[PDB]
Design an enzyme around this catalytic site. Structure first.
Site: not given
Ligand SMILES: NC(=O)CC[C@H](N)C(=O)O
Ligand SMILES: CCOc1cncc(-c2ccc(C(=O)NC3(c4csc(NS(=O)(=O)C5CC5)n4)CC3)nc2)n1
Ligand SMILES: CCOc1cncc(-c2ccc(C(=O)NC3(c4csc(NS(=O)(=O)C5CC5)n4)CC3)nc2)n1
Ligand SMILES: CCOc1cncc(-c2ccc(C(=O)NC3(c4csc(NS(=O)(=O)C5CC5)n4)CC3)nc2)n1
Ligand SMILES: O=c1ccn([C@@H]2O[C@H](COP(=O)(O)OP(=O)(O)OP(=O)(O)O)[C@@H](O)[C@H]2O)c(=O)[nH]1
Ligand SMILES: O=c1ccn([C@@H]2O[C@H](COP(=O)(O)OP(=O)(O)OP(=O)(O)O)[C@@H](O)[C@H]2O)c(=O)[nH]1
Ligand SMILES: O=c1ccn([C@@H]2O[C@H](COP(=O)(O)OP(=O)(O)OP(=O)(O)O)[C@@H](O)[C@H]2O)c(=O)[nH]1
Ligand SMILES: NC(=O)CC[C@H](N)C(=O)O
Ligand SMILES: NC(=O)CC[C@H](N)C(=O)O
Ligand SMILES: [Mg+2]
Ligand SMILES: [Mg+2]
Ligand SMILES: [Mg+2]
Lengths: 533, 533, 533
Positions: C387, C503, C505
């Site tokens: 992310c 993500h 995971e």
């Molecule tokens: N899920 C995250 O790691 C968020 C990453 C970043 N703050 C966004 O809003 O894209």
């Protein structure tokens, strides 16, 4: 066994003991042998120490058990004779466990309320359920256990914890639980307020007991909506929500429970194998004539006495109008402070058809009871003296007929030169069932007792008539087996002037009033002259 | 008075009795005379019936009170001598109220837990607070009351209800309440979980007591966030949230409470008018040399004994390595089933610098204790026998030196032709403080007791050495005032082979180890030869 | 249906969610389709607002449900895909009832917690049990419901009241209840203290739920005596008292419950019609080689991430040594205050075999994550950015390779002239399951994803890579179906330097690690060269 626990919900006084007794007479009408146990969450070992304004009318069993009046309700709804230990208490069960601990019988372990006290309760309830308290030596097929007071008071918690175990020790077919609640109907509101019943059954379920039946002490009958709301918030079937409402006589309380289907419920719920009560109720509701009886007391304290008079009244077929008189209002001392009390008390006593002078102890009302017996002599009103009333009749005779104007008991004036009734303990109190022999045939009392040579009645006294002064005294028609103790007295040339040293009321039933209470009621309406004929 | 209640929160065992004792030594260090009371919510009248695996080590007071080990912690943190009734129980208080009811002292009223039991608790706490249990006859200026167990158990409810009244009977300046809780730190979580403390203090406030202090039994010290969360959910000031964490010695527990400001709190909170404990802790943490002592037992059951050895160890300036040996592993029977247990138990006993053979009853470990005393004779290892260990030394001597190979007690083999120790009750148990006279100067024990002609020590036994066989026996250096009873024995030609019939451990303090335990520790490191010099 | 409720007793953290998940995998191994529900007694509508230090690792479902990590444990023990409403809360159920009230759907009646909220809970549990969350559209044969927190907290009372009704709404064959308790074993005591379990089950029964199973979270296994004491005081059969103790791996927790007979119990108790977990445990316990992986974080917050790495580790057949690094320690600012933190954090990062740069929001650790990605470029250590780590890789590339030294996100420095990642909401957050297309075959990531043309993965971000600057940038191998949004990036001439915008995971299972986490683990041990071969 088969067990029915009966727990109290919101308050005492709501007739839970009448429900337990009514359920017992319903079970007995199903052909079952039935026993009953009262648990009283007080620290007292028996009721034999209560000033009768608190837990009034100590009922004396055959074994000398001075127990709560509910044990006497069991003996009147059910043809049973109970033992001391049918009144269980925290004092009795904790003292049992403590003595058993001091003995080392708990094998050097910790002893504590759960398990050991809650075990001891179950042991007690198992023991007293096996005892054939019924009028034949056959084992009880069911045991109705009443828990005194309200659930969730600190004293009632051990017993509910014991029953919470018990329902899994014996199987569910062997253990049912009734909750007797109140549904108040306030002047402030007019609605039948189920909220206390909900909260009480919520509390009871927190202690791990379900109501199998919810009995609502109603004033006026429950509405459908209120029954449905109770069924909902108690989480139980509507058929198992019962209203016991105000009814014309005690005799209708089993009939209302019968109508409410509790018989049918218990038959299926416990897997088990009242026409007289119709008659007694319908008879009571058609008594057009009346009898007025003076009760000259000191102290609900006369619960058995009032009931014995009402059995006698129902049997002669009159209503009863009990003139409750404080014997201290009849004393001339009250005329100095409150002449209104004196003149109302003496209007009551003088307008009565007969007089009853019941048992007690201590100096209060003693000269008033002696004067009420004096009024019975000289106006020829029919008199029964019970326990103390007998002793005071020997005193009143001695003062007026023998001229021994000083005469009294060793309790009230120990300085007296004519102690005509004296302290005479058992070689303890003369407490429980003793046999009295009728020393003659010249007794109306013997004939009322079926012309029997003896009777066996429950006593509760330390004092007896003095055998020295007896020679001058007032025919002592009933005496003990030793001839030491005078137990019934009858005065000549009077319609009915009887003293009994025992408590006849403890053996009065609707189906069989005690013959001194019956003879008094018969005498006060003149009908004794047809009865003895 | 001034009162500090100490209530338990989540579990027992969390050192609540050490907190109560530490608070008492803190108050005593403020120049106050201090007494203490333990309430144990069990039904037992005293601990004098427990198999020591449950509520282990019955501590015997001067009056013969067989009480919980926490009463012994009070006597070791505070220079006090307690009475039986400083151990309050439900058995004692209910039996008091029941006897008082049977007496008629409650004036024919109902007796019930609230008020009458909760009154009786306050009466008891008032009585026992006035008694000068301190080393001078001056009245206690404060009383630390410990409630045993966890709050909101059915047995603890009467006592919290009593204290809920008490805080308004005496004024708030006279009554403070500490809650001793646990803050667990799970392997499953790593966080210090305040939730049980919150729920425990929520429950305590439901019973109507606030914590004035919240003492958290921590493993590792509380984080700031956890202290703040506790302060929040217990609704109390952070300064009044205390962590007692794991520390190197018992001697640091008052010092941690001191650091945590409880002294300053109690001074203001109760409106009241440890440098040795620095030294004892810092001394303990710098003991480089060690002593290894065999404790040959059967049964925490040796709590006082272990403490007495550790006082003695601290005084000689060695660490202590107590070789805990089950005496039934030393018996040849164990070599048939489990030779591993036998050979580990005999490696332990043989590698010790000295041996201790503590009190008890029943046949378990008796031949093993006789063999451990045999090992002490023939290898010349320093021996103390305490209560039973003395009796078994007479047996072991008789079997080997007199050739009376049969010889035993009347407890263990009543059929024996040489009953060298016999059942000899007091003309009851020899229980409590008796005076022993030293019958001579030929005693190392007398010299350890300051060369005093007598000592006064707490006994707890029925059996004594046989005065017939005594003539053949093993110098009985300490005897009772009657000369009937042998109370200390000392064997010739041995470095230190002493039996004491009493329990020295009950009068051991950090500032004064009991001389038989000190003499044993001195002997096992050879230093006795410099001490007596 | 068939229902198993799982309630918490003494504390949270004790692995209740692992027990619920283990019971679900046991039921699934019996051939049953199984669903699961988490009830969280908080007022929050979903977890999508928590700072990850409180209820850490918000697990994102396919529908965009930001829920508790226990829903992710269900998806990893059971082959299921859950919906938002499988996380029930007080916020969700009260808002439901309030909106339903405002609609007039409660027909102008009173609405109140009992019945209406406790009805709504049962309605919810009925709905979510019928949904085929399993990997095939067949209806769940059983539903495991977990009640979050401890029972008898004010927030958990509505749910236990709902389940107290539910056990009589559905029949007892359709409803079982497990209680997960703690049995603490204090440093202060050494005993396994059952008291909190007794009091917790006492409290639960006060709320009207019995444990059908009592699961003790033990450290060390329960003694027989402690199990018997629990069976006694919880009033349940010993066979139904389970210990879950400390074990070498998560994979043994179902096996311990299996050994403890819960399978056999549920089969009979619910009237119903793990060999891989032996292998996974025994495999884990024989991994002799190791891999060391840097996790450069800010925030238990990485629960899914740590698990995904451990699946990947187990699959390559190495142990894992996760170097937990605070990304704010790597920032040069920390070297000014605490050079010890800086140099320990940089010893950790530099000694790793590969690096993982997981998701988040806000400025903390952003320059540290950019520097940890810089270290991955220039030292050629294998990198996965998840992310945010992807976005910061575009930043780190831009700063060093394009010389755009200013470059950043519009989140962290909105004033920047090269906003290389920009705020790009869905025409809301890119939250839940989106389809990514692989735009090429020149991707190791595509080959790790089985050479598939697309994948579908759970996203949780507002920001995306700037499509203007993209033309200068660092092969964006994975893109959305619109081509608007770059979703996987791969840097040329590096062993493994991958950013994923999603993500991975959340879709890692033991039987199938997510290919970017697997590719990273394979790369860090060099084995990727044999895998792609
Ligand atoms: N899920 C995250 O790691 C968020 C990453 C970043 N703050 C966004 O809003 O894209
Ligand atoms: C839950 C109870 O609800 C209700 C509802 N409505 C009314 C009553 C009610 C309660 C008491 C009384 C009462 O005491 N009446 C008297 C009497 C005569 S005989 C006797 N009892 S007895 O001897 O045991 C015999 C039966 C075996 N009582 C005249 C004195 N009458 C009515 N009870
Ligand atoms: C809330 C308590 O929290 C904590 C936290 N951390 C540690 C301890 C802790 C508890 C017990 C022990 C202990 O028993 N130690 C020994 C000893 C010697 S002297 C004596 N007690 S004593 O004779 O009364 C004397 C003082 C007046 N004990 C050696 C045997 N040592 C440490 N307690
Ligand atoms: C009541 C629970 O009692 C006990 C008692 N003793 C020990 C544990 C225990 C708890 C958590 C852990 C743990 O987290 N281990 C890891 C892992 C790998 S895979 C995964 N979980 S998982 O992906 O859902 C997969 C299974 C479906 N966890 C390495 C990170 N390991 C042991 N739990
Ligand atoms: O003053 C008010 C206003 C509103 N309410 C609301 O009324 C609900 C019912 O509170 P009640 O006391 O009316 O209880 P109930 O209907 O269960 O039982 P009875 O009337 O038969 O005694 C409560 O749960 C609350 O939401 C009040 O109790 N009182
Ligand atoms: O300080 C004392 C003295 C006595 N007792 C007495 O011990 C009894 C047991 O109190 P415990 O706390 O030992 O509980 P338990 O044995 O049920 O559970 P665990 O030890 O496994 O946690 C109590 O009911 C009380 O009578 C104490 O609790 N504490
Ligand atoms: O499984 C879950 C999910 C959510 N919650 C929610 O967490 C809140 C806190 O529940 P905790 O048990 O974490 O309590 P606490 O923070 O007061 O104390 P410790 O951690 O120090 O022991 C609860 O009130 C509930 O809303 C849980 O308890 N458990
Ligand atoms: N039962 C009674 O009426 C008691 C009468 C009198 N006080 C006695 O002890 O004999
Ligand atoms: N206190 C003890 O060690 C008891 C010793 C022995 N059983 C006796 O009664 O004398
Ligand atoms: Mg209402
Ligand atoms: Mg918490
Ligand atoms: Mg215990």
């Amino acid at each position: 066994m088969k067990y029915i626990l009966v727990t109290g919900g919101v308050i005492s006084g709501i007739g839970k003991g009448i429900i337990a007794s009514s359920v017992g007479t319903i079970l007995k009408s199903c052909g079952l042998h039935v026993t009953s146990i009262k648990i009283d969450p007080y620290i007292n070992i028996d009721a034999g120490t209560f000033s009768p304004y608190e837990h009034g009318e100590v009922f004396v069993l055959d074994d000398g058990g001075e127990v709560d009046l509910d044990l006497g309700n069991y003996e009147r709804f059910l043809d049973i004779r109970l033992t001391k230990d049918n009144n269980l208490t925290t004092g009795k069960i904790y003292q049992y466990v403590i003595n058993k601990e001091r003995k080392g019988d708990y094998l050097g372990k910790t002893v504590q309320v759960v398990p050991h006290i809650t075990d001891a309760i179950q042991e007690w309830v198992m023991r007293q359920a096996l005892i054939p308290v019924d009028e034949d030596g056959l084992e009880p097929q069911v045991c109705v256990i009443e828990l005194g007071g309200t659930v969730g008071d600190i004293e009632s918690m051990p017993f509910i914890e014991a029953f919470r175990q018990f329902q899994f020790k014996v199987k569910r077919e062997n253990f049912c639980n009734i909750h007797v609640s109140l549904v108040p109907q306030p002047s402030s509101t007019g609605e039948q307020k189920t909220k206390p019943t909900q909260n009480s059954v919520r509390e009871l379920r927190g202690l791990g007991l379900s109501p199998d039946l919810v009995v609502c002490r109603c004033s006026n009958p429950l509405d459908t909506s209120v029954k449905e709301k109770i069924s909902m918030f108690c989480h139980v079937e509507p058929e198992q929500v019962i209203c016991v409402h105000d009814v014309s006589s005690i005799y209708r309380v089993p009939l209302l429970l019968e109508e409410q289907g509790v018989v049918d419920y218990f038959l299926r719920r416990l897997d088990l194998p009242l026409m007289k009560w119709k008659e007694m109720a319908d008879r009571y509701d058609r008594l057009l004539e009346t009898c007025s009886i003076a009760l000259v007391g000191k102290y609900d304290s006369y619960a058995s006495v009032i009931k014995a008079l009402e059995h006698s009244a129902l049997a002669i077929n009159h209503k009863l109008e009990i003139k409750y008189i404080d014997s201290a209002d009849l004393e001339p001392i009250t005329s100095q402070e409150e002449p209104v009390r004196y003149h109302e008390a003496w209007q009551k006593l003088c307008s009565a058809h007969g007089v009853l002078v019941p048992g007690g102890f201590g100096v209060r009302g003693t000269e008033g009871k002696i004067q009420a017996i004096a009024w019975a002599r000289n106006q020829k009103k029919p008199f029964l003296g019970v326990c103390l009333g007998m002793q005071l009749a020997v005193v009143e005779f001695s003062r007026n007929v023998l001229g021994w104007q000083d005469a009294n008991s060793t309790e009230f004036d120990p300085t007296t030169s004519h102690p005509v009734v004296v302290d005479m303990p058992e070689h303890t109190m003369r407490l429980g069932k003793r046999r009295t022999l009728f020393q003659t045939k010249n007794s109306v009392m013997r004939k009322l007792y079926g012309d029997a040579d003896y009777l066996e009645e429950r006593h509760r006294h330390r004092f007896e008539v003095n055998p020295v002064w007896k020679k001058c005294l007032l025919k002592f028609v009933g005496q003990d087996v030793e001839g030491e103790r005078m137990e019934i007295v009858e005065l000549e040339d009077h319609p009915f002037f009887v003293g009994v040293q025992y408590h006849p009321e403890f053996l009065s039933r609707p189906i069989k009033p005690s013959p001194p209470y019956f003879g008094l009621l018969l005498a006060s309406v003149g009908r004794l002259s047809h009865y003895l004929q």
